[PDB]
Amino acid sequence: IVGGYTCGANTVPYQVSLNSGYHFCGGSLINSQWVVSAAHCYKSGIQVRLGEDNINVVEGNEQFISASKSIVHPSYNSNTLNNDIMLIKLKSAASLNSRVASISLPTSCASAGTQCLISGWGNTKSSGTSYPDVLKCLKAPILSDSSCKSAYPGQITSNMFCAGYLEGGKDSCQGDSGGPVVCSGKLQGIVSWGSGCAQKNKPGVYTKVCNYVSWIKQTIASN
Numbered sequence: 552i553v554g555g556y557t558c559g560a561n562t563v564p565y566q567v568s569l570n571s572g573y574h575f576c577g578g579s580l581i582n583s584q585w586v587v588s589a590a591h592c593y594k595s596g597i598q599v600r601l602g603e604d605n606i607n608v609v610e611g612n613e614q615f616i617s618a619s620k621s622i623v624h625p626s627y628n629s630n631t632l633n634n635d636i637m638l639i640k641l642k643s644a645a646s647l648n649s650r651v652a653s654i655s656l657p658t659s660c661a662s663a664g665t666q667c668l669i670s671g672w673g674n675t676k677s678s679g680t681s682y683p684d685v686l687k688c689l690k691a692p693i694l695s696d697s698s699c700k701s702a703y704p705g706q707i708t709s710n711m712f713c714a715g716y717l718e719g720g721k722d723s724c725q726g727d728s729g730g731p732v733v734c735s736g737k738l739q740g741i742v743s744w745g746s747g748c749a750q751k752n753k754p755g756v757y758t759k760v761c762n763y764v765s766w767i768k769q770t771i772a773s774n
């Protein structure tokens with residue numbers, strides 16, 4: 552997160568870290584046994600870390616659970632990042648408490664102008680490199696589809712939306728991938744892509760979660 556703020560320990564209790572020997576992507580806990588992330592975050596050997604604040608210090612509220620299965624969306628296109636969504640099933644159920652909690656899936660899609668909360672442990676610089684130890688947060692609005700399409704002509708599908716600031720300075724970044732965009736108490740987006748981070752006229756592009764709720768519910772009910 553570029554231009555964000557320190558969230559505060561466990562104030563984003565649905566945020567997870569995906570770890571393959573090192574933090575590499577974010578995700579969101581949607582019930583005791585399932586996490587949603589980005590399909591471009593796929594790898595083998597995922598451990599899901601819940602209840603994290605400082606990802607480099609064991610502070611006492613963590614739960615570390617290995618993934619039993621990953622399921623990339625059937626229509627994921629790694630070239631265009633269309634359908635950039637994946638489900639991760641935990642080998643055992645997390646214990647839900649005040650520091651580890653699930654986020655609701657949307658019943659209705661979110662609207663332009665809504666302010667959302669984006670969070671993660673990704674890069675905090677626009678062209679330099681600095682990765683934080685503690686979770687960072689960003690408030691950012693959903694942009695109109697016409698502005699999104701103007702920023703990235705020929706690149707935006709109906710499964711994507713833009714959020715952020717056309718003037719630049721505030722955005723998600725590498726390492727935040729897979730993490731949440733929460734609007735009005737619902738998981739509406741997944742950190743997906745962008746040209747650089749926090750560049751002028753290049754806002755963040757997010758997987759539109761409300762298009763996937765049927766697939767998520769059916770997949771959970773079957774695995």
Ligand SMILES: [Ca+2]
Binds near residue numbers: 609610
């Ligand atoms: Ca920790």
